[PDB]
Write a protein that binds this DNA or RNA. Structure first.
Ligand SMILES: [K+]
Ligand SMILES: [Mg+2]
Ligand SMILES: [Mg+2]
Ligand SMILES: [Mg+2]
Ligand SMILES: [Mg+2]
Ligand SMILES: [Mg+2]
Ligand SMILES: [Mg+2]
Ligand SMILES: [Mg+2]
Ligand SMILES: [Mg+2]
Ligand SMILES: [Mg+2]
Ligand code: NA
Ligand code: NA
Length: 86
RNA sequence: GGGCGGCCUUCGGGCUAGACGGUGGGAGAGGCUUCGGCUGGUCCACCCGUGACGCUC
């Protein structure tokens, strides 16, 4: 579920400015937020499988944004890859 | 890794129409579950955010 007291919390942390809600960093961060939130899920339910489909999609997406931000803005890449760790 | 890709530009650099994110909706014979749930995807809107971040073996 996450909720604002989570999803907004991350954004307010990775935002590049007061109102940022879709800046690659934020996009990656909260992307890494539900990636875990679901990694944990799959454990309790090792028979789900179907949900793993998205675990993979989300993971790929997260790496594609990161590669994008690695070309256009190296500095910010190391920054972001921290506070989360790649 | 490969192949093919938006607009403008005096090529320095602009920009949003794509994609993604935020918000708010919608439908579903998704899946798993000790039945208390936990969760994947999918389609809409806006005229909010990033700014081609894409599509394809
Ligand atoms: K499915
Ligand atoms: Mg696809
Ligand atoms: Mg440019
Ligand atoms: Mg999506
Ligand atoms: Mg709803
Ligand atoms: Mg049900
Ligand atoms: Mg759901
Ligand atoms: Mg917009
Ligand atoms: Mg730029
Ligand atoms: Mg291009
Ligand atoms: Na094309
Ligand atoms: Na223009």
């Amino acid at each position: 579920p996450i909720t604002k007291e989570e999803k907004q919390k991350v954004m307010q942390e990775f935002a590049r400015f007061p109102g940022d809600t879709g800046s690659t960093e934020v996009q990656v961060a909260l992307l890494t937020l539900r990636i875990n939130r679901l990694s944990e899920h799959l454990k309790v339910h090792k028979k789900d499988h179907h949900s793993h489909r998205g675990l993979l999609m989300m993971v790929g997406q997260r790496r594609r944004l990161l590669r994008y931000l690695q070309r256009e803005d190296p500095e910010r890449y190391r920054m972001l890859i921290e506070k989360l760790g790649i």
